[PDB]
């Protein structure tokens, strides 16, 4: 007997057909277009969407006026709206089924860096997060797959400790200045 969790879940599912070339291309479109790193994380968001669909289907089977469907219904719509993937005017359980996969990747923080014009490229956005340059509400985020919420959308900017922000210069800039005046004096 030990005091620990042992509660581990997998976040993705490998596809059935391994070499369906049609399937290989839309996965490659999403990787290059959203600057992903491997097929895993595009399978991850597909697994994240897979639950929400089947968790919505299971409520579509029960009748209306069912307290289970009524409570769990808007509770699921609460989270999808608070992450800005569903619009508040379309809040009804039958509209989640029509929601597709690239709507989620739009809410990924890496894309929001490129969407707000703070990065030269969707690939330049990922190195800014991996180098601890931006922050969300006074919290330096180190992860591009950070799902930004709808209300925390407008509070994305550079961290105050960053040469790209109002901070000290980097290691290269302080080295280009040391020998710049050391060679001159």
């Amino acid at each position: 007997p030990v005091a620990r969790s042992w509660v581990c879940r997998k976040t993705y599912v490998t596809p059935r057909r391994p070499f369906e070339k049609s399937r290989l291309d839309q996965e490659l479109k999403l990787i290059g277009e959203y600057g992903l790193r491997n097929k895993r994380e595009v399978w991850r968001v597909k697994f994240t969407l897979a639950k929400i669909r089947k968790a919505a289907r299971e409520l579509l089977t029960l009748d209306e006026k069912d307290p289970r469907r009524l409570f769990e219904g808007n509770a699921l719509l609460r989270r999808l709206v608070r992450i800005g993937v569903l619009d508040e005017g379309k809040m009804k359980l039958d509209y989640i089924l029509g929601l597709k996969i690239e709507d989620f990747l739009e809410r990924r923080l890496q894309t929001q860096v490129f969407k707000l014009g703070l990065a030269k490229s969707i690939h330049h956005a990922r190195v800014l997060i991996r180098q601890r340059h931006i922050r969300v509400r006074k919290q330096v985020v180190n992860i591009p797959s950070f799902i930004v919420r709808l209300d925390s959308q407008k509070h994305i900017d550079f961290s105050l400790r960053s040469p790209y922000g109002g901070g000290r210069p980097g290691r290269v800039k302080r080295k280009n200045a040391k020998k710049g005046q050391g060679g001159a004096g």
């Binding site: 601890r132 922050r135 006074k138 919290q139 330096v140 180190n142 961290s159 105050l160 400790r161």
Partner: protein, 124 residues
């Protein structure tokens, strides 16, 4: 430059102390060492820094903020009456014996071999 806020503050009549969770704001510099928080709270609550027992500090990712936990006692006789002695040894007022937990057990059962007053002779 460091600022201290008090949270979840409540006094203990059952322990003759007051207790609160500390969060320090130290943007740009290292997490403040514990001995320094003592006098800063002493300036805060109008007390002596030696009756200030703080611990459990762990800065958040990205720096700037460190949440710690601190005790403030009514007097020094209490601070030695109800306190984990390991936290007293953080201040040099308590020092535990230098016998490893292993050596106390070989000496324990070696005295079980003898019966009577000769138990004190086997030890060393």
């Amino acid at each position: 430059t460091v600022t201290i806020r008090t949270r979840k503050f409540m006094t203990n009549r059952l322990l003759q102390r007051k207790q609160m969770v500390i969060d320090v704001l130290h943007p740009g510099k290292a997490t403040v060492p514990k001995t320094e928080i003592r006098e800063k709270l002493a300036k805060m609550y109008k007390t002596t820094p030696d009756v200030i027992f703080v611990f459990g500090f762990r800065t958040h990712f990205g720096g700037g903020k460190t949440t710690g936990f601190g005790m403030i006692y009514d007097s020094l006789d209490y601070a030695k009456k109800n306190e984990p002695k390991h936290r007293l040894a953080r201040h040099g007022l308590y020092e535990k014996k230098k016998t490893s937990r292993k050596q106390r057990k070989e000496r324990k059962n070696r005295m079980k071999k003898v019966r009577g007053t000769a138990k004190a002779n086997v030890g060393a």
